[PDB]
Amino acid sequence: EMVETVCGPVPVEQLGKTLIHEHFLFGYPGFQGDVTRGTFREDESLRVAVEAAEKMKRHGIQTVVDPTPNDCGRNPAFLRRVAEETGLNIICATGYYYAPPYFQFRRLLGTAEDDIYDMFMAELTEGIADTGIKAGVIKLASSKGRITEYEKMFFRAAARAQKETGAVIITHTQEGTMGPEQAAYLLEHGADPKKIVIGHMCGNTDPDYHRKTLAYGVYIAFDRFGIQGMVGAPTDEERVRTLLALLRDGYEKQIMLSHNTVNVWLGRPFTLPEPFAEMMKNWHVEHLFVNIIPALKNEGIRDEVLEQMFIGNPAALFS
Amino acid sequence: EMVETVCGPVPVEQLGKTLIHEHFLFGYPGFQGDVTRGTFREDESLRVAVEAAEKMKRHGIQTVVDPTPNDCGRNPAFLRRVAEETGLNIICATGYYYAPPYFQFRRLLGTAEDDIYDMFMAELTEGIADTGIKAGVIKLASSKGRITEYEKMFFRAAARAQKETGAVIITHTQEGTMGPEQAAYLLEHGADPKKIVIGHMCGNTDPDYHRKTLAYGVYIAFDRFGIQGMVGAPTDEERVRTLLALLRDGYEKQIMLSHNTVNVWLGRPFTLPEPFAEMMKNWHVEHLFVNIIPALKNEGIRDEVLEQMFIGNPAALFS
Numbered sequence A, B: 001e002m003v004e005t006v007c008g009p010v011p012v013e014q015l016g017k018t019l020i021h022e023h024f025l026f027g028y029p030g031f032q033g034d035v036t037r038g039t040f041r042e043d044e045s046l047r048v049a050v051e052a053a054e055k056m057k058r059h060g061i062q063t064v065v066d067p068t069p070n071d072c073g074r075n076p077a078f079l080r081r082v083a084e085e086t087g088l089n090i091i092c093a094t095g096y097y098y099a100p101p102y103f104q105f106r107r108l109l110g111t112a113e114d115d116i117y118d119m120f121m122a123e124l125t126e127g128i129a130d131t132g133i134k135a136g137v138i139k140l141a142s143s144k145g146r147i148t149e150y151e152k153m154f155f156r157a158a159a160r161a162q163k164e165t166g167a168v169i170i171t172h173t174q175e176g177t178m179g180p181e182q183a184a185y186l187l188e189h190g191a192d193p194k195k196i197v198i199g200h201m202c203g204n205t206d207p208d209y210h211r212k213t214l215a216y217g218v219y220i221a222f223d224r225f226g227i228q229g230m231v232g233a234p235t236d237e238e239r240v241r242t243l244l245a246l247l248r249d250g251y252e253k254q255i256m257l258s259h260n261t262v263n264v265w266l267g268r269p270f271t272l273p274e275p276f277a278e279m280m281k282n283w284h285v286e287h288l289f290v291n292i293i294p295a296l297k298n299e300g301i302r303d304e305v306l307e308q309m310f311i312g313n314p315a316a317l318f319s
């Protein structure tokens, strides 16, 4: 019936057309230390965030899931201002970026898993900090080729919180690995497959890997459209090829699409070197609508299917 | 002549009796993510910080160096309130805690070392964030048994900044390793030995290691008095034994003492288990004065020598 947004509970039937994964603000953990030369400018950042939101609305987007982790500059009050300014629904997350010393220490104390669970529960059902704003998703990540014991604590805490709240879990997979293992581990700890999104699945170009992941009944996200040439992320050409194969296999009810944009970078400004700058030129919130979707239609993907991915799937995911 | 404190430039001759290493606030990197259950309470934190300062002033302490790193909750405006409240001089640092994603990324961009140098220079000569408060020390750290290439970037940036500003460098060594290598690397990049403090040297109990470090002409700090209880980690009894040997070798002009206290922990509150708790029971700002110093005097250490360590050495270090 309802889902927690940065503006409070909203009927799931009102979410409409949704981008499952985009960042209004993002900083890599550590950006905090570089505050002097990387100061946050609120007015300019809000202006940029709002322009990005208006671009999305132009393409009919009504809802954005912004899963910026707790240590990556997640700012619920800022996201509420963006929502208030634009009428967009924005759903935020609780979780940590892809071990940090704070949690090495609580592991020592032996309280880490319970502390993480308590954190998830507080942010899902009480509010983040003193904002009164609640997260609607739990964000998780694992390592390349392995789900470490550290990471499993988070997975276990997430499974517990998911069982109590019915919140959605969104994961990050590293370099196209551990999709099946993520789903299996969550399910083995009681998590609901219909409330799980295995993310960055576009990082793998082997359809068998996807089918193995999809067999668990979870959602999967091709959530990095526009990102090419870095991380050894595949090309958009490769993403589309993989997507087309799955869609022609009838998997549209388990697939969602996004760009993983960072519209305002936190910390010190930078500029990408010339070779990558060009490969990364389509990495913006309009890319799916101006480039990818028309290419899909040319390959015979019907509106029905597209609507299922952008509207049907988020509705079912959050209900 | 002058040193930058959180209240601005102060004559070095007014520093007087000094604790070279104590934290008013500290959180392990990652504490930021746990804001909801680990909210910073300003009034209570200030009250606790000020009480700690007043305990130090009771033992004649007039200056504290608080080298809390940039990513560990360093809060110059807070430290200035403590100083204003108590009359203490407080000198803060610029540096990162003992590679986080932010700097892995700038390493990719190839600008990391220059960025770190720029950061040091800005914080030493302009001010931290918008506070107008300048650091007086550069804080550095290396790994157990190795100074990594990542860490060496910081060391190189620090050496450059030190040559330009004459600022002091304070290091963290991990588990009694790399003292000599730290001094050698800094000196090889032009840093001034009389402006360097190799920290946590109390972590090693082999006097030859200390003498090898001292041979470079740097200061060394026994800066963790009261910290005891980890298996294989040094006891206060062991610290005193090592210290006594060096003092009887005539090294008092290169040695400084501290506790490395954390008076207010940032992030979620915790309680140490009963056994470790009892071992850690002397970890407070009065410990050197009520326990360690009287024990030194019983072993024949004269006031002259103690005065050199607590007053003479910091004066020479910062001048």
Ligand SMILES: CCCC(=O)N[C@H]1CCOC1=O
Pocket (backbone or CB within 6 Å): A023, A026, A227, A230, A260, A261, A262
């Ligand atoms: C430029 C490389 C791509 C990138 O920065 N991805 C970021 C976006 C948010 O989560 C990530 O890891």
Ligand SMILES: CCCC(=O)N[C@H]1CCOC1=O
Pocket (backbone or CB within 6 Å): B026, B227, B260, B261, B262, B272, B280
């Ligand atoms: C409670 C155990 C001791 C401990 O955590 N010391 C910490 C505090 C400051 O930097 C240290 O290394």
Ligand SMILES: [Fe+3]
Pocket (backbone or CB within 6 Å): A021, A023, A260
């Ligand atoms: Fe992301």
Ligand SMILES: [Fe+3]
Pocket (backbone or CB within 6 Å): B021, B023, B260
């Ligand atoms: Fe310290």
Ligand SMILES: [Mn+2]
Pocket (backbone or CB within 6 Å): A172, A260
């Ligand atoms: Mn991601």
Ligand SMILES: [Mn+2]
Pocket (backbone or CB within 6 Å): B172
């Ligand atoms: Mn340290």
